Structures are given as structure tokens and as C-alpha cells.
């Protein structure tokens, strides 16, 4: 329907100086870096992603898909794509999220994370997702590992490696085979490989649980083959200790079998917002260079 007029920006390799690896693995490597366009007199902290070295024409098709998706989103709670670089090895340039991945941030900081933070993150992610829903986009890989931390007060949804743009009002996405995170998935997904905005809500549910348990592993133990039967059984994840029944009851709703019974992201924004006005009522926690510009201030 609506034409996608997003701009894809092609950047010169000599406009950005790498600085250090921040993570390599199966997927590839990610660099901390600076982007210093033309004469513009700005330096922009960036992360440079290079889907390994291996230039198999499979690895460039995928990174180009991510870039497609990331170029089509503009929201405070969704990660910023700056452009791509067309070297032999094709590089994704995104905004640096210095504090890293939110899952590691909760593990690394429990003893210092208060309810105000937990509830604010929940609101911010719900905003990111509500906005993806507006852009008729289905994330399919929402999990705490895929949300990054720009500042502890500001998180952004990332990893669009599995995301799909729903074509002409095509209610649900029918997927191929291939590796898929089972423990974060709606049931109608694990069984029929259907993916809906409502199935994203489910993973929102597990994402919140990962936050409230400070980074625990969903169904730690249970191998992935059981997960479907276990959920048909009516079993769900346990109420985290810090969690009031108010909060946990919202998790549980994300995990209903009737997809349309679960809450809409716009509703999750509201509920978590109300809770964020009085955090200690809802979560019970012991103790409770010169020309640098952030990407979020660098517009064109
Ligand atoms: C566990 N999740 C990973 C940690 C990581 O590799 C991944 C693939 C994962 O996260 C989504 N990843 C991306 C994957 C797809 C698009 C963008 C990123 C990405 C970015 C950044 C990452 C950082 C770290 N990853 C960063 C980034 C590791 C910690 C330092 C910063 C960053 O600063 N801006 C973008």
C-alpha cells in the first residue's frame, strides 16, 4: 500500500575509524567506532557490524535485509541505522549503544537496579513495539538480549535479523523452517509457524520476566522439544520474587492461548506507565572528543 520512502545511506570507509571489537561470534563481528562525515565537524559514536568475513552471497543478502528493515524505522525506542558501507565485506553502521545489551546489564547490575528502572524499561520497549506495530512490522525475535542500552535511562529494540514487513494487509506471517528461539515464542508460532503482533506480545511477556528475574533463563533446564507440550499443558513461567500480582498478572495475559486475548502494546504502555508513577507499590526490591554528537541528535 504506502510507498516506503526511507533513505538508504551509503557511507565511505574512509569516513569512519574503527576503534575496537565489541563482539564476534557465529553471526560475525561488531566494532566500536567513530563516523566523521565530510567536513561536517561532528564525530558520531557508531557500532559497525560485519556479518563475519566469509563473503558467501548468502551473508550479504541477509545483512542487506536488516539494513532494509532498520532504514525503514524511526523511533526513539528503536535502534538507529546510520547507513551501510559497500566494501567487499558489507558493513552495517548503527548508533553506538555504549552500555551494551540489556540482558547482560541486568545480570551485571542486580544489586543496583531499582523498580523505577525496571518499569521504565518495560514502558520504553512497549513503545518501540507499539511503533513497530504501527509500521506493520513483526519483530519475531524480541528478547532481552536484543534490547540495547544507550543510557541506563534509555533502551532501544534492536536485532531485526528475523523481522518481517507485513505486505498488503496480510494479518499473519507464515514462516519457513530454520533456527528460531523457542522459549520466547507464542504457541501458535511453535506449532503452525504463525507470527503476529500478538505473538510479539508473548515474547514481550518473556522479555519482562527476564528483566524482573534479573536475567534468568526461561525454563532453565527444560529442552526445547518439551516447551510446546508444557505450554499446552497450561504451564507458564513462575512469578518472579520482586513481582506483585499486578505486574505478574500482566505477564500471564501476554501468555494466553487465544492470541487476541493478550494485551495490545498500546495497552502495555498504559499499564506500565501507571505503575511507573508509583514503582514501589508494584515491584518489591530489597534496598530499592570535542565535536562528539549522539546519532539521535544527528539528523539529515
Ligand atoms: C546479545 N546481543 C548482541 C550483542 C552485540 O552484538 C549484537 C549482534 C547483539 O545485540 C543485538 N548487536 C547487533 C545486532 C544487530 C544490529 C545491531 C547490533 C548491535 C549494536 C551494538 C552492540 C553491542 C554489542 N552487540 C551489539 C549489537 C555487545 C556490547 C557492546 C555494544 C551497538 O552498540 N550498537 C548496535
PDB file of N, CA and C in Angstrom, residues 222-265:
ATOM      1  N   UNK A 222      14.476 -27.364  31.056  1.00  0.00           N
ATOM      2  CA  UNK A 222      13.588 -27.891  30.010  1.00  0.00           C
ATOM      3  C   UNK A 222      14.173 -27.701  28.586  1.00  0.00           C
ATOM      4  N   UNK A 223      14.560 -28.811  27.898  1.00  0.00           N
ATOM      5  CA  UNK A 223      14.960 -28.653  26.491  1.00  0.00           C
ATOM      6  C   UNK A 223      13.786 -28.348  25.547  1.00  0.00           C
ATOM      7  N   UNK A 224      14.139 -27.677  24.447  1.00  0.00           N
ATOM      8  CA  UNK A 224      13.181 -27.001  23.582  1.00  0.00           C
ATOM      9  C   UNK A 224      12.010 -27.850  23.033  1.00  0.00           C
ATOM     10  N   UNK A 225      12.209 -29.169  22.973  1.00  0.00           N
ATOM     11  CA  UNK A 225      11.224 -30.097  22.392  1.00  0.00           C
ATOM     12  C   UNK A 225       9.992 -30.162  23.290  1.00  0.00           C
ATOM     13  N   UNK A 226      10.229 -30.078  24.604  1.00  0.00           N
ATOM     14  CA  UNK A 226       9.128 -30.148  25.584  1.00  0.00           C
ATOM     15  C   UNK A 226       8.243 -28.890  25.589  1.00  0.00           C
ATOM     16  N   UNK A 227       8.907 -27.737  25.425  1.00  0.00           N
ATOM     17  CA  UNK A 227       8.296 -26.417  25.584  1.00  0.00           C
ATOM     18  C   UNK A 227       6.865 -26.361  25.046  1.00  0.00           C
ATOM     19  N   UNK A 228       6.615 -26.896  23.861  1.00  0.00           N
ATOM     20  CA  UNK A 228       5.260 -26.836  23.304  1.00  0.00           C
ATOM     21  C   UNK A 228       4.195 -27.616  24.099  1.00  0.00           C
ATOM     22  N   UNK A 229       4.622 -28.719  24.701  1.00  0.00           N
ATOM     23  CA  UNK A 229       3.671 -29.623  25.332  1.00  0.00           C
ATOM     24  C   UNK A 229       3.363 -29.035  26.711  1.00  0.00           C
ATOM     25  N   UNK A 230       4.452 -28.727  27.423  1.00  0.00           N
ATOM     26  CA  UNK A 230       4.463 -27.896  28.617  1.00  0.00           C
ATOM     27  C   UNK A 230       3.553 -26.677  28.547  1.00  0.00           C
ATOM     28  N   UNK A 231       3.464 -26.003  27.408  1.00  0.00           N
ATOM     29  CA  UNK A 231       2.563 -24.857  27.324  1.00  0.00           C
ATOM     30  C   UNK A 231       1.161 -25.200  26.928  1.00  0.00           C
ATOM     31  N   UNK A 232       0.950 -26.432  26.494  1.00  0.00           N
ATOM     32  CA  UNK A 232      -0.392 -26.816  26.062  1.00  0.00           C
ATOM     33  C   UNK A 232      -1.050 -27.344  27.310  1.00  0.00           C
ATOM     34  N   UNK A 233      -0.227 -28.070  28.076  1.00  0.00           N
ATOM     35  CA  UNK A 233      -0.417 -28.393  29.495  1.00  0.00           C
ATOM     36  C   UNK A 233      -0.939 -27.213  30.366  1.00  0.00           C
ATOM     37  N   UNK A 234      -0.663 -25.968  29.965  1.00  0.00           N
ATOM     38  CA  UNK A 234      -1.133 -24.773  30.689  1.00  0.00           C
ATOM     39  C   UNK A 234      -0.077 -24.212  31.634  1.00  0.00           C
ATOM     40  N   UNK A 235       1.085 -24.873  31.702  1.00  0.00           N
ATOM     41  CA  UNK A 235       2.250 -24.387  32.463  1.00  0.00           C
ATOM     42  C   UNK A 235       2.819 -23.071  31.878  1.00  0.00           C
ATOM     43  N   UNK A 236       3.214 -22.159  32.773  1.00  0.00           N
ATOM     44  CA  UNK A 236       3.867 -20.930  32.390  1.00  0.00           C
ATOM     45  C   UNK A 236       5.068 -20.656  33.239  1.00  0.00           C
ATOM     46  N   UNK A 237       5.673 -19.506  33.070  1.00  0.00           N
ATOM     47  CA  UNK A 237       6.849 -19.211  33.840  1.00  0.00           C
ATOM     48  C   UNK A 237       6.396 -18.727  35.209  1.00  0.00           C
ATOM     49  N   UNK A 238       7.232 -18.957  36.253  1.00  0.00           N
ATOM     50  CA  UNK A 238       6.845 -18.626  37.647  1.00  0.00           C
ATOM     51  C   UNK A 238       6.808 -17.111  37.885  1.00  0.00           C
ATOM     52  N   UNK A 239       6.004 -16.657  38.831  1.00  0.00           N
ATOM     53  CA  UNK A 239       6.025 -15.292  39.302  1.00  0.00           C
ATOM     54  C   UNK A 239       7.394 -14.912  39.885  1.00  0.00           C
ATOM     55  N   UNK A 240       8.081 -13.920  39.312  1.00  0.00           N
ATOM     56  CA  UNK A 240       9.352 -13.541  39.978  1.00  0.00           C
ATOM     57  C   UNK A 240       9.126 -12.989  41.391  1.00  0.00           C
ATOM     58  N   UNK A 241      10.046 -13.277  42.336  1.00  0.00           N
ATOM     59  CA  UNK A 241      10.035 -12.749  43.744  1.00  0.00           C
ATOM     60  C   UNK A 241       9.722 -11.258  43.886  1.00  0.00           C
ATOM     61  N   UNK A 242      10.276 -10.414  43.033  1.00  0.00           N
ATOM     62  CA  UNK A 242      10.106  -8.988  43.221  1.00  0.00           C
ATOM     63  C   UNK A 242       8.735  -8.531  42.747  1.00  0.00           C
ATOM     64  N   UNK A 243       7.952  -9.457  42.210  1.00  0.00           N
ATOM     65  CA  UNK A 243       6.793  -9.085  41.440  1.00  0.00           C
ATOM     66  C   UNK A 243       5.507  -9.135  42.148  1.00  0.00           C
ATOM     67  N   UNK A 244       4.835  -8.004  42.201  1.00  0.00           N
ATOM     68  CA  UNK A 244       3.466  -8.032  42.678  1.00  0.00           C
ATOM     69  C   UNK A 244       2.575  -8.833  41.727  1.00  0.00           C
ATOM     70  N   UNK A 245       1.512  -9.370  42.280  1.00  0.00           N
ATOM     71  CA  UNK A 245       0.489  -9.915  41.450  1.00  0.00           C
ATOM     72  C   UNK A 245       0.027  -8.928  40.334  1.00  0.00           C
ATOM     73  N   UNK A 246       0.023  -7.616  40.558  1.00  0.00           N
ATOM     74  CA  UNK A 246      -0.331  -6.677  39.471  1.00  0.00           C
ATOM     75  C   UNK A 246       0.585  -6.843  38.237  1.00  0.00           C
ATOM     76  N   UNK A 247       1.894  -6.879  38.482  1.00  0.00           N
ATOM     77  CA  UNK A 247       2.838  -6.960  37.426  1.00  0.00           C
ATOM     78  C   UNK A 247       2.736  -8.321  36.762  1.00  0.00           C
ATOM     79  N   UNK A 248       2.696  -9.402  37.556  1.00  0.00           N
ATOM     80  CA  UNK A 248       2.768 -10.767  37.043  1.00  0.00           C
ATOM     81  C   UNK A 248       1.471 -11.115  36.280  1.00  0.00           C
ATOM     82  N   UNK A 249       0.398 -10.496  36.660  1.00  0.00           N
ATOM     83  CA  UNK A 249      -0.834 -10.736  36.024  1.00  0.00           C
ATOM     84  C   UNK A 249      -0.729 -10.178  34.552  1.00  0.00           C
ATOM     85  N   UNK A 250       0.025  -9.091  34.354  1.00  0.00           N
ATOM     86  CA  UNK A 250       0.245  -8.598  33.004  1.00  0.00           C
ATOM     87  C   UNK A 250       1.094  -9.576  32.188  1.00  0.00           C
ATOM     88  N   UNK A 251       2.147 -10.135  32.785  1.00  0.00           N
ATOM     89  CA  UNK A 251       2.897 -11.206  32.111  1.00  0.00           C
ATOM     90  C   UNK A 251       1.996 -12.348  31.624  1.00  0.00           C
ATOM     91  N   UNK A 252       1.330 -12.989  32.565  1.00  0.00           N
ATOM     92  CA  UNK A 252       0.373 -14.020  32.296  1.00  0.00           C
ATOM     93  C   UNK A 252      -0.587 -13.700  31.133  1.00  0.00           C
ATOM     94  N   UNK A 253      -1.171 -12.507  31.093  1.00  0.00           N
ATOM     95  CA  UNK A 253      -2.016 -12.134  29.934  1.00  0.00           C
ATOM     96  C   UNK A 253      -1.283 -12.227  28.550  1.00  0.00           C
ATOM     97  N   UNK A 254      -0.013 -11.834  28.511  1.00  0.00           N
ATOM     98  CA  UNK A 254       0.786 -11.970  27.295  1.00  0.00           C
ATOM     99  C   UNK A 254       0.894 -13.442  26.874  1.00  0.00           C
ATOM    100  N   UNK A 255       0.648 -14.331  27.829  1.00  0.00           N
ATOM    101  CA  UNK A 255       0.881 -15.713  27.593  1.00  0.00           C
ATOM    102  C   UNK A 255      -0.401 -16.460  27.420  1.00  0.00           C
ATOM    103  N   UNK A 256      -1.497 -15.786  27.161  1.00  0.00           N
ATOM    104  CA  UNK A 256      -2.666 -16.581  26.819  1.00  0.00           C
ATOM    105  C   UNK A 256      -2.658 -17.311  25.503  1.00  0.00           C
ATOM    106  N   UNK A 257      -3.516 -18.315  25.374  1.00  0.00           N
ATOM    107  CA  UNK A 257      -3.527 -19.185  24.202  1.00  0.00           C
ATOM    108  C   UNK A 257      -4.285 -18.412  23.138  1.00  0.00           C
ATOM    109  N   UNK A 258      -5.411 -17.806  23.481  1.00  0.00           N
ATOM    110  CA  UNK A 258      -6.116 -17.009  22.495  1.00  0.00           C
ATOM    111  C   UNK A 258      -5.383 -15.680  22.151  1.00  0.00           C
ATOM    112  N   UNK A 259      -4.570 -15.710  21.103  1.00  0.00           N
ATOM    113  CA  UNK A 259      -3.766 -14.548  20.707  1.00  0.00           C
ATOM    114  C   UNK A 259      -4.464 -13.182  20.884  1.00  0.00           C
ATOM    115  N   UNK A 260      -5.732 -13.083  20.496  1.00  0.00           N
ATOM    116  CA  UNK A 260      -6.454 -11.804  20.656  1.00  0.00           C
ATOM    117  C   UNK A 260      -6.894 -11.504  22.081  1.00  0.00           C
ATOM    118  N   UNK A 261      -6.655 -12.451  22.966  1.00  0.00           N
ATOM    119  CA  UNK A 261      -6.944 -12.253  24.374  1.00  0.00           C
ATOM    120  C   UNK A 261      -5.815 -11.502  25.036  1.00  0.00           C
ATOM    121  N   UNK A 262      -4.597 -11.669  24.521  1.00  0.00           N
ATOM    122  CA  UNK A 262      -3.450 -10.994  25.069  1.00  0.00           C
ATOM    123  C   UNK A 262      -3.580  -9.488  24.893  1.00  0.00           C
ATOM    124  N   UNK A 263      -2.791  -8.689  25.652  1.00  0.00           N
ATOM    125  CA  UNK A 263      -2.933  -7.235  25.522  1.00  0.00           C
ATOM    126  C   UNK A 263      -2.276  -6.691  24.258  1.00  0.00           C
ATOM    127  N   UNK A 264      -2.785  -5.551  23.785  1.00  0.00           N
ATOM    128  CA  UNK A 264      -2.141  -4.780  22.700  1.00  0.00           C
ATOM    129  C   UNK A 264      -0.998  -3.957  23.301  1.00  0.00           C
ATOM    130  N   UNK A 265       0.147  -3.873  22.611  1.00  0.00           N
ATOM    131  CA  UNK A 265       1.221  -2.945  23.032  1.00  0.00           C
ATOM    132  C   UNK A 265       0.754  -1.562  23.502  1.00  0.00           C
TER     133      UNK A 265
END
